[PDB]
Symmetry: D2
C-alpha cells in the first residue's frame, strides 16, 4: 500500500505543498493541460526522487495526467515525512520513503518499486535504472523510456550506454537549459548555504569556504558564499572552469593546499573521495565539511571514522569527530546532500522549471513510444525554450522582440 | 521561581548552548577571568534579552562573576524554550520567558524582574529601564547602572535623558564599534535572510527586496540580499545614507513608489508605521512583509488585521492576510524581529563581541560605582578596542603594527 | 608598401607592444614553436583586425611562422598608429590602417588587401571574407581557409553558408571556449567601462546603466557595471538569458521602459537599431549612449542626427546632441566599439588566448589544406583545452588531477 | 604673474572644465549665490589643490564670490596643464603649477603663494599651512582661517594643534560626511583603478590585489577591485577595520605575508614606508606597486632606486625597476597619487560635494571672522546635511520624510 513514517502528518504536508505551489506556475499549466489530455492513461510509473513539497507537486501533475505512480526516496535524509503522508492520504499515490530509513529499507523500496513493473521510470542519481538493468532484464519490455534528474545520473547513464546496456530511451532532464542553468546553479547556491546555516547557525562572513568543483553547482555555491561575505577557494580538475573561477575573483588551488586553509568545505564534483584522509590531518581545528553532490562518497567519511577516536552529535545534522590530538572535524548531514539533509532542498521556484521539464519529458517518451532510438535523448529545444518563456512570463518580466528589419539584417552578409 | 515552557528541554538547550560557545572565545576569556575575580559578588542583576544560546553564554559568564541574575524575554517570539530550560535546570538561573507568551505574561515578567531589586539592569529595547523609571522611583537607590543592547533602546534612553529622568548611568552597548559595526550589520544581514528562508524557503534570486532604512542594519540586509541574487530597493528619510545606497548600486525611492514593486519588504528603521495601509493597498498579490527592527510597530499590522477579511497560517511563522478585494499580503513572524522569530538570531561569532561589551560594561559600572555621572555613557575606547583585538586574534588573523619611525611620522607636521 | 599615419611613431609602438607581450605567454610559446616549424612557409595571408598592441603580437607570431602578412584595420577608430608604425618599421609587415580614416580609405584598404591574393584570411566582423565572396569569385582558388574573430562575423558566415556561398573552410575562432568565455566576457567587461571612463571620467556608482543583450559580452558588461556601483538594467530578446540576468540580480525590462530610466546605455547585441528614435525622445537629459557590439549600427545615430538641432564635441570621443527642447543625448565614440574607440581595447591577457586560438586555427587550415569540408569548422577541443592548460599554468595556478580510483568510479554505473 | 606649462592649452582646458561642471550642480548653486552676495569681497585667498577640472570649478566659484585667489599645485604629477592654462587665460586667476615640475619649483610656488598674503588658505595635505606657521609667524594676522581637503592634512593639523602652534581656525573639510563618505570611498575606488588601467591596460580580473589600509579609501579600492574580478588582500594596523575587511570577504594578513602573493599593491594608509625593501625582495617578478595615499612616502621608493641596477620607462606613467638578481618591480606614477598621476582623479560627481564643503567652509570662516576659537573645526552639521540634501535632489532621487506621529514616537520613552 505504502511505507511512510506517520500518516497523521498529512495536513502539514498539504499545507507546505500548496505553499510551494505558489511559485510553481509553469508546472501548474502543464498539470492543468495534462488533466484534459491524460497523456499517461493506462501508464504505470515510478519516481525515485527527493520526497519534498516540489516533488509532490510533480507527482500531482503526473497523477492528473492519468499515471499510476509510486514514489520512493532518492536519499534517506531528504525525505519529508509530512509530504510523504499527504501524498498517500490526499491523492492515493503509494509512497515508500521514510526520513532516516536505513539502507536495507532503501533497497527494499527499490525492489517494491520495480515490482510495480513501471512503463516510465523517473530517476535521480540513476539508482533504479541501474538496478533495473542489472537485476530485471526480463522487465525491459515494459520500458517506454526513463528520465534522469541530476548530473551524477547522467554520468552513470553514459557508462550504461558505453557498456552497451542502455537499450532504451533515457531523457536527459538534468542538461536542459531551464534545468541546470537554474536548479543546479541558483537553487543549489542558496539551499546549500541554507542547510549549513540551519545545521550550525554559523556566520559565513569572514570564513574561508572551499568549494570543490566549479560546474553548475560549484558556480552557484561559490557565488552565494562570496555574496554572504566569505573568502572563497575553488578546486578543480579542468583548466577552463578553473580559469573562470580565478577571473571571477576566487582563489584556485589544489585541495591539498586548500585543506590547510578552509573553515567550511563543500564538495560539488560528482566524483569520489574529493576530500581525503591526507586532507583531514591538516585541517583547522573545528573545520566543517559537507557535500552537495548527489552521493555522500565525495567525502571519505569511512577514513575519517577510523582516524577519529570519538564521534559525537553536537547539533541537528551535525557530528563532531575528535582526532587523537584533540582537533575536531565537523561533518554536517553525514555527508549527504546538505541542502536536502539539513534543510528543505531547492526553493520551488527552480523546481517548477525542473519538473516542468520532468513532466514534458515523460509526455515526450509516451507520445513517441516505439519511435525513439535507444540511448540518451536531449530535451527538445522548443520544449526547453517554451518553459523559459512561461517562467519569464510568470515572473512578471517582459522583454523585446526583433522587428522585421532586425530579422532581415541578421540574414544579410 | 521561574516561568518557562518545559524544563525537560534542558538537554537540547545545553547542547545548543555548548555549540554556540565555540565561536564565543572573547566571552570565554572574560568568563574565565570573572570566575577568578568575582566582579559581581553581592550584585543582583536583571537581564532583559532575547533568550538565545548566545544570551545563555552571557548569563553563564555573569553567573561566573558572582552575579545573582534573573533573566526575562525581550520579545515574546524570540525565546528559545530549550535555552530557558537549560539555564534553569543546569545553572539555577531564574528565567521568566515562554516562546509565544501573550503581552500580559510579558508585562508580568517585567514586574517580577523589577521585584528582584536589581543593582545592574541589562536591557534590550529599554522596556525594563523605562518601567523602572516610570513606576519604581522608590527603587532607584538600588541602581549602580544599566546597559542597553540595541539602537531603539538607545533612542529611548536619549528621550529619557532629555526628559531629565535618566538619573543613573546607562552604558550604550549598541553604539560600541565592536557592537554595531558587526552585530547590526553582518549579523542582521545574514540572520534576517535566514529567518525569511526558514519561514518560506522562497528563492531570493530574482526577487525585488525593499529594505526600509540604510543604517547599520539596513546596510547588512541589502548587502546580503544583493549577495543572494535579489534586486534591492532602499527607502530612507535622510540624504546621507540615501546617497550611500545609490553609490552601493541600489535603487533609492520613497516607500509609496517601492510599495508596488517589492516582492519582499524588510523594515530596519527603528521608526513607527514605516509600512502603512496606503502601502498594503498597492502591493503585489502575495508580497511578503517582515520586520527586523526591534519592535513590530514598524509595520502597521493593526490596520492590516482590520482591513483583511481573513488571515490563515500557511507555513511555520507565516500568515496570509486576504484583503477584501482578494489580494494577499504575507507576514512573517507576526512582524516581530524576523531573524529571531523564524530562525535563531545572529550567529554567535558576532554576539561574542556584543556580549563581551555587555560583560565588560557591567564590570565597568560596578568598579566605578559612585563615580559616574548620570546619563548615557559610551563604552570606554580601551574596552572597545581590546574586544576587537581579542576577536581578531581568535579569528586567526594577524596584522601589522607601527614602527617607531611611523609613529614619529604621525606626530610630525613640518 | 603600406598606408599608415606616421612612421616616426615606431619606438612608441614597440614599447607598448612588448609591454603587452608580458601577459601573452601562451602566444609566446606558439610563436616560439612556429619559428622552428615554419607552418606558413610560402603562404600569403591577410589580417583584418583591430590595429592594437595585441594584434601586433599575433602578426609577429605569424611572421615568425613564415607568413607573408598584410594587416588592415577592422574599424577606423580602433587603429593605434604607433603600433601600425612599429609593424612596418621593425618587422617589414605592410599595414594599411590609419586612426580615423574615412570610409573611402577603409574600402580602399580592403581592395589593397585582396590584391595580395591571400591564401589565409583572418577576419573580424567578416568584411573582407564577404567582399571576397561578392567581388572576387575568381580568387577563390587561392583560399585554403579563413578565420573569424567576433560573434557578428560568425552570424554573417551563417548567412553565407545558408546562402550557399560559404564554399571554403572558415575557422570559428570566436566560439572557442578559451576565446569568448574570457575575451567577450571579462575583456569586454573591463575595457567597455574603460572606454566610457577615459571618454568622460564619469562616476559609474549611483548611475542606472542599461545593458542591451545578456550574452557573453552582456554578462561581462553588466557584471563589471554592478561591480563598479551601478544599478544595472538588462534588455533581451530571448527568455533563457533574460531569466539569467534576473536571477543575477539585474532588472530585466523592454528597452522602451529602460529608455526613461538609463543614465548610460551600452549595446552588445550584434543586432541592428537596438536603440531607436522613439527611445531618444524619452531619455533623461544628458543620458549617455555607446556601443560595444562589433558594428556601430546598434544605435540609430542617423535618426539621432536628424532629430537633433545641434551636435558638438564636448570631450575626447564624446559628442553632445542637443534636441529642439534643449535636452541632450551624449554619444561616445560615434557609436563605434567604445572600448576600442575611446581606450585601447581588451587587455592583452585575454587576447593571448584569443590569438593563440587565431594562431593555431591558421595552422589548422594549412596542416589540413585540401582535406576540410566547406563551411564552418570549430576549434578542435584538444587545441581549445591545451590553450586553457597553458594559460592556467602561466597564471601560476595549480589544480587537481583524478586518481586511478576516481577514474574507475566514473566508469561504473 | 603665473607659472604654467603652456597657455595655448586653454581651449582644451575650458572644454574639460565645462564638461566637469555637468555633474557639479551643488557647486553651481553655490557659485550662483556667491555671484550675488559676494561673500569673499576684499579677501585674498590661496588654494593648494590638485589642478584639475574640478578644482577649476571651485576656483571659479570662489572668483564669483569676489575672492582674489592664487592657485598652486598640491602634487607635481597631478597638475592638468590645460586647466592651468584656462584659469589663467579665461579667468585671470594666477596659477603656479606645471605638470611634472621638480621639487625646487614646487617649493618656490609655495613661497610665491605665501607672498600673496592670503586671508583664507585652502590646503590639500597641509604643505602651505605648515610652511606658513613654520616660516611666516609675522604673517599670521592676515589669517581669517584655513581649510584642509585630505586625511593626511588633518593628521598634520592635529599634530600642529598638539604642538600649540595652530593659532587660527582650520576647517576639517575631509571629515565632513558629504566629503570622506563619498570622495574618499567611491571616488578613490573608481579613480585609483582608472589610473592603474590607463597606465598599463592590465586585466584586473584574476589578479591578486593587495590593499594596504582599510579606512575610507581602502574600503573603496578593495570594493572596486573586487567588483572588477580581483582577488583582494587587505593589510592593516588596527583590529576594527581588519575584522570589517574579513566580514566583507577579503583576506587580511600582514604585509610581509601579502608581499609574496600580490600582483598589484595599492597603499592608502596615510603612513610612511608601508612597503619596504624587505617586501620588494620577495615580490613576484613583475609585481605592480602604486600609491593612492596623499604622499609618495607610503612606498620606500628611495631604497628601491638604490637597490635596483636599472630603471626604464616601459609605458606612460610606468617604470620598470630591475633588481640585481634580475627580478622586476613595476611602479606607476612614481608612487604619487595614482588616480591623479595616471588618470584624471575623482569624477566630478563626488568632487561636487567635497568642493561644496570647501566653498561653504570658506564662507563660514569669513562670516565668523573674529568669532572662532583657534584650532580644528568640524564642518557645521547644517552645512554638511544641506550639501547632502542638494546632491540627492540633483541626483533625481526622492526619499521619505517623518510624519508628525513618527517624530512623536522618537521623543517618547514610556
Ligand atoms: N544538492 C543538490 O541540490 C544538487 C543539485 C544539482 C546537482 N547536484 C549534484 O552536484 C554535482 C555536481 O553537478 P554539476 O551540475 O555542478 O556538474 P558539472 O558537470 O556541471 O560540474 C562539476 C564540476 O566538478 C569538477 N570536478 C570533478 N571532479 C573534481 C575533483 N576531484 N576535484 C575538483 N573538481 C572536480 C568538474 O571538472 C566540473 O567542472 C553532481 O553530483 C550533481 O548530481 C546536486
Ligand atoms: N534584528 C536584529 O537582530 C537587530 C540588530 C540590531 C539592531 N536592530 C534594530 O534594527 C533597527 C535599526 O537599527 P540600526 O543600527 O540600523 O540603526 P541606525 O541608526 O544605524 O539606522 C537606521 C536608519 O533608518 C533610517 N530611517 C529611519 N526612519 C526611516 C523611515 N521612516 N523610512 C526609512 N528609513 C528610515 C535612518 O535614516 C537610518 O539611516 C533598530 O530598531 C534596532 O534596534 C535589530
Ligand atoms: N567590443 C568588443 O571588444 C567585443 C568583443 C567581443 C564581441 N563583441 C561584439 O559584441 C556583440 C555581442 O557578442 P556576444 O558574444 O555577446 O554574443 P552572444 O550571441 O553570446 O550574445 C548576444 C545577446 O544579445 C541578445 N540580443 C540580440 N538582439 C537583441 C536585441 N535587439 N535586444 C536585446 N538583446 C538582444 C541575444 O539574445 C544574446 O543573448 C557582437 O556584435 C560581437 O561581435 C565586441
Ligand atoms: N588619492 C585620492 O584621491 C585620495 C582621496 C582621499 C584621501 N586620500 C589619502 O588616502 C589616505 C588614506 O585616507 P583615508 O580616508 O582612507 O583614511 P582613514 O583614516 O579612513 O583610513 C586609513 C586606514 O589605514 C590604516 N593604516 C594606517 N597605517 C597602516 C599601515 N602601516 N598598514 C596598513 N594599514 C594602515 C588605518 O588603520 C586606517 O584603517 C590619506 O593619505 C588620504 O589623504 C587620497
Ligand atoms: N542570537 C542573539 N542572541 C541575543 N541577542 C541577539 C541575538 N541576535 C540579535 N540579538 C540582539 O537583539 C537586539 C535587537 O533587539 C540587537 O541589538 C542584537 O544585538
Ligand atoms: N579630481 C580631483 N580634483 C581635485 N582634488 C581631487 C580630485 N580627486 C581627488 N582629489 C582630492 O585630493 C585629496 C588627496 O590629496 C583627496 O582628499 C581628494 O578630495
Ligand atoms: Cl505546455
Ligand atoms: Cl578583558
Ligand atoms: Cl602549442
Ligand atoms: Cl547653500
Amino acid at each position: 500500500k505504502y511505507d511512510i513514517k506517520d500518516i497523521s502528518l498529512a495536513p502539514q504536508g498539504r499545507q507546505r505543498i500548496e505553499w510551494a505551489a505558489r511559485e510553481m506556475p509553469v508546472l501548474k499549466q502543464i498539470r492543468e493541460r495534462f488533466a484534459q489530455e491524460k497523456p499517461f492513461a493506462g501508464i504505470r510509473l515510478v519516481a525515485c526522487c527527493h520526497v519534498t513539497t516540489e516533488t509532490a507537486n510533480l507527482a500531482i501533475a503526473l497523477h492528473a495526467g492519468g499515471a499510476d505512480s509510486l514514489l520512493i526516496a532518492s536519499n534517506p535524509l531528504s525525505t519529508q515525512d509530512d509530504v510523504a503522508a499527504c501524498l498517500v492520504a490526499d491523492y492515493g499515490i503509494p509512497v515508500y520513503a521514510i526520513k532516516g530509513e536505513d539502507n536495507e529499507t532503501y533497497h527494499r523500496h527499490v525492489q517494491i518499486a520495480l515490482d510495480h513493473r513501471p512503463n516510465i521510470i523517473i530517476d535521480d542519481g540513476s539508482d533504479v535504472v541501474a538496478t533495473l538493468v542489472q537485476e530485471r532484464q526480463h522487465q525491459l519490455s515494459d520500458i517506454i523510456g526513463t528520465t534522469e534528474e541530476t548530473t551524477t545520473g547522467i554520468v552513470r547513464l553514459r557508462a550504461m550506454f558505453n557498456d552497451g546496456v542502455l537499450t532504451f530511451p533515457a531523457m536527459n532532464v538534468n542538461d536542459a537549459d531551464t534545468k541546470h542553468f537554474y536548479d543546479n546553479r541558483y537553487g543549489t547556491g542558496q539551499s546549500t548555504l541554507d542547510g549549513i546555516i540551519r545545521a550550525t547557525n554559523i556566520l559565513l562572513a569572514g570564513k574561508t569556504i572551499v568549494v570543490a568543483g566549479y560546474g553548475w553547482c560549484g558556480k552557484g555555491v561559490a557565488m552565494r558564499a562570496k555574496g554572504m561575505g566569505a573568502d572563497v577557494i575553488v578546486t578543480e580538475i579542468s583548466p577552463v572552469p578553473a580559469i573562470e573561477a580565478a577571473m571571477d575573483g576566487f582563489r584556485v588551488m589544489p585541495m591539498a593546499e586548500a585543506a590547510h586553509q578552509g573553515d567550511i568545505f563543500i564538495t560539488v564534483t560528482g566524483n569520489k573521495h574529493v576530500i581525503r584522509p591526507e586532507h583531514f590531518a591538516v585541517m583547522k581545528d573545528g573545520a566543517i565539511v559537507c557535500n552537495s553532490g548527489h552521493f555522500d562518497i565525495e567525502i571519505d567519511l569511512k577514513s575519517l571514522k577510523e582516524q577519529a577516536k570519538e564521534v559525537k552529535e553536537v547539533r541537528n545534522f551535525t557530528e563532531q569527530y575528535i582526532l587523537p590530538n584533540g582537533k575536531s572535524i565537523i561533518v554536517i548531514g553525514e555527508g549527504r546532500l546538505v541542502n536536502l539533509a539539513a534543510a528543505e532542498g531547492h526553493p520551488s521556484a527552480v523546481m517548477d522549471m525542473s519538473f516542468a521539464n520532468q513532466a514534458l519529458a515523460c509526455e515526450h517518451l509516451v507520445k513517441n513510444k516505439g519511435q525513439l532510438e535507444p540511448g540518451m535523448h536531449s530535451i527538445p529545444v522548443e520544449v526547453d525554450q517554451e518553459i523559459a518563456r512561461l517562467k519569464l512570463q510568470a515572473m512578471g518580466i517582459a522583454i523585446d522582440s526583433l522587428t522585421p528589419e532586425q530579422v532581415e539584417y541578421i540574414n544579410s552578409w
